[PDB]
Scaffold this active site. Structure first.
Site, PDB file in Angstrom:
ATOM      1  CG  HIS A 122      -0.514   0.331   2.474  1.00  9.15           C
ATOM      2  ND1 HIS A 122      -0.412  -0.643   3.442  1.00  9.15           N
ATOM      3  CD2 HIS A 122      -0.076   1.503   2.992  1.00  9.15           C
ATOM      4  CE1 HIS A 122       0.084  -0.045   4.509  1.00  9.15           C
ATOM      5  NE2 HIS A 122       0.306   1.244   4.285  1.00  9.15           N
ATOM      6  CG  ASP A 162      -0.342  -3.979   2.702  1.00 12.41           C
ATOM      7  OD1 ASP A 162       0.287  -3.524   1.728  1.00 12.41           O
ATOM      8  OD2 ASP A 162      -0.679  -3.291   3.686  1.00 12.41           O
ATOM      9  CB  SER A 180       1.773   1.284   7.003  1.00  7.63           C
ATOM     10  OG  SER A 180       1.848   2.453   6.216  1.00  7.63           O
ATOM     11  N   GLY A 181       4.450  -0.477   6.768  1.00 17.00           N
ATOM     12  CA  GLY A 181       5.638  -0.924   6.053  1.00 17.00           C
ATOM     13  C   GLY A 181       6.723  -1.380   7.001  1.00 17.00           C
TER      14      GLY A 181
HETATM   15  C1  LIG Z   1       0.878   5.736   0.258  1.00 17.15           C
HETATM   16  C2  LIG Z   1       0.727   6.764   1.336  1.00 17.15           C
HETATM   17  C3  LIG Z   1       1.391   6.371   2.667  1.00 17.15           C
HETATM   18  C4  LIG Z   1       0.731   5.136   3.305  1.00 17.15           C
HETATM   19  C5  LIG Z   1      -0.777   5.283   3.643  1.00 17.15           C
HETATM   20  C6  LIG Z   1      -1.323   4.465   4.840  1.00 17.15           C
HETATM   21  C7  LIG Z   1      -0.568   4.688   6.155  1.00 17.15           C
HETATM   22  N1  LIG Z   1      -1.073   3.840   7.259  1.00 17.15           N
HETATM   23  C8  LIG Z   1      -0.246   3.652   8.397  1.00 17.15           C
HETATM   24  O1  LIG Z   1       0.885   4.164   8.430  1.00 17.15           O
HETATM   25  C9  LIG Z   1      -0.684   2.817   9.549  1.00 17.15           C
HETATM   26  C10 LIG Z   1      -1.926   2.376   9.669  1.00 17.15           C
HETATM   27  C11 LIG Z   1      -2.340   1.568  10.806  1.00 17.15           C
HETATM   28  C12 LIG Z   1      -1.708   0.338  11.024  1.00 17.15           C
HETATM   29  C13 LIG Z   1      -2.076  -0.438  12.116  1.00 17.15           C
HETATM   30 CL1  LIG Z   1      -1.291  -1.957  12.402  1.00 17.15          CL
HETATM   31  C14 LIG Z   1      -3.072  -0.019  12.991  1.00 17.15           C
HETATM   32  C15 LIG Z   1      -3.707   1.197  12.760  1.00 17.15           C
HETATM   33  C16 LIG Z   1      -3.347   1.986  11.656  1.00 17.15           C
HETATM   34  N2  LIG Z   1      -4.105   3.188  11.373  1.00 17.15           N
HETATM   35  C17 LIG Z   1      -5.495   3.325  11.267  1.00 17.15           C
HETATM   36  N3  LIG Z   1      -5.769   4.647  11.093  1.00 17.15           N
HETATM   37  N4  LIG Z   1      -4.592   5.294  11.087  1.00 17.15           N
HETATM   38  N5  LIG Z   1      -3.591   4.474  11.243  1.00 17.15           N
HETATM   39  C18 LIG Z   1      -0.526   6.173   6.507  1.00 17.15           C
HETATM   40  N6  LIG Z   1       0.645   6.821   6.521  1.00 17.15           N
HETATM   41  C19 LIG Z   1       0.352   8.158   6.650  1.00 17.15           C
HETATM   42  C20 LIG Z   1      -1.019   8.340   6.787  1.00 17.15           C
HETATM   43  N7  LIG Z   1      -1.580   7.073   6.688  1.00 17.15           N
HETATM   44  C21 LIG Z   1       1.409   9.124   6.467  1.00 17.15           C
HETATM   45  C22 LIG Z   1       1.443  10.222   7.319  1.00 17.15           C
HETATM   46  C23 LIG Z   1       2.423  11.196   7.211  1.00 17.15           C
HETATM   47  C24 LIG Z   1       3.440  11.071   6.228  1.00 17.15           C
HETATM   48  N8  LIG Z   1       4.532  11.970   6.050  1.00 17.15           N
HETATM   49  C25 LIG Z   1       4.705  13.202   6.653  1.00 17.15           C
HETATM   50  O2  LIG Z   1       3.918  13.831   7.339  1.00 17.15           O
HETATM   51  O3  LIG Z   1       5.948  13.711   6.291  1.00 17.15           O
HETATM   52  C26 LIG Z   1       6.410  14.982   6.771  1.00 17.15           C
HETATM   53  C27 LIG Z   1       3.418   9.963   5.320  1.00 17.15           C
HETATM   54  C28 LIG Z   1       2.426   8.988   5.421  1.00 17.15           C
HETATM   55  N9  LIG Z   1       2.394   7.880   4.535  1.00 17.15           N
HETATM   56  C29 LIG Z   1       1.399   7.650   3.588  1.00 17.15           C
HETATM   57  O4  LIG Z   1       0.503   8.479   3.485  1.00 17.15           O
END
Ligand SMILES: CC[C@@H]1CCC[C@H](NC(=O)/C=C/c2cc(Cl)ccc2-n2cnnn2)c2nc(c[nH]2)-c2ccc(NC(=O)OC)cc2NC1=O
Length: 238
Positions: A44, A93, A188-189
């Protein structure tokens, strides 16, 4: 990471910060060094990534502030996404990044062991989720790598928690029934590392959850043991 504490330098030397360069450079996902030219991450993470030319892998990092224009990284030669992958909530994933150059192993960057096929029967009691992600749903990326000890959850118990989802054996869940400790946005990752016989194993890849550290909502991870043969297929190609 929700409800975690600051990691110490060299605690998770397989942990990497995967950065994207388009439109501006920022942390994208976590990842794990599993070989001298291989990073194991979530599929993802590459939603809307047109080429690996925009990716930069940083290893041996504790604090995101260590990264500036003069900080060395590893370029990405190839992005290998599992070809049954549709979305995080459906599984598969998992992705591999093949690096343009070899990682020099030391005490700041080294590989994590993959789980053995014979270790599908073992019950891990010392598991940690690591990352630079949010401490709560509406937050920002953390400077210092955070860590959280989370208990492993049975597929049956995880399936009860996610009514309306199909929790497969290719998924592994972790969390406290009362919540409070979990992965969150930006994690994530990254790895779900479990210590067993004084050896750390990559049990899971941080995938998805309904919100962050909620009561009766375990974090859902890619069950790495179920992809050992797929990883070897891509990393050991003749
Ligand atoms: C392809 C796009 C990628 C991956 C998208 C999915 C990811 N999920 C996660 O990282 C974890 C999800 C999760 C995993 C588990 Cl095991 C349990 C509960 C969870 N969540 C449910 N709701 N939120 N988190 C996520 N990452 C961000 C937001 N969402 C994120 C935030 C901030 C920055 N950079 C930043 O500010 O730089 C200055 C970069 C990202 N990266 C992404 O957008």
């Amino acid at each position: 990471i929700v409800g975690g504490t600051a990691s110490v330098r060299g605690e998770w030397p397989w942990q990497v910060t995967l950065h994207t360069t388009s439109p501006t450079q920022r942390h994208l996902c976590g990842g794990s060094i599993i070989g001298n030219q291989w990073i194991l991450t979530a599929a993802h993470c590459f939603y809307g990534v047109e080429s690996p030319k925009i990716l930069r892998v940083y290893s041996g990092i504790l604090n995101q502030s260590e990264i500036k224009e003069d900080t060395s990284f590893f370029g990405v030669q190839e992005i290998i996404i599992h070809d049954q992958y549709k979305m995080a909530e459906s599984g598969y994933d998992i992705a591999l990044l093949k690096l343009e150059t070899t990682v020099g192993y030391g005490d700041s960057q080294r590989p994590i062991c993959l789980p053995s096929k014979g270790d599908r029967n073992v019950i891990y009691t010392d598991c940690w989720v690591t990352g630079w992600g949010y401490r709560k749903l509406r937050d920002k990326i953390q400077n210092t790598l955070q860590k959280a000890k989370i208990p492993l959850v049975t597929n049956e118990e995880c399936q009860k928690r996610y009514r309306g989802h199909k929790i497969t054996h290719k998924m592994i869940c972790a969390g406290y029934r009362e919540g409070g400790k979990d992965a969150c946005k930006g994690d994530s990752g990254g790895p779900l590392s479990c210590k067993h016989n004084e050896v750390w194993h990559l049990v899971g890849i941080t995938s998805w959850g309904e919100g962050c550290a909620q009561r009766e909502r375990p974090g859902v991870y890619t069950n790495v043991v179920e992809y050992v043969d797929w990883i070897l297929e891509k990393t050991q190609a003749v």
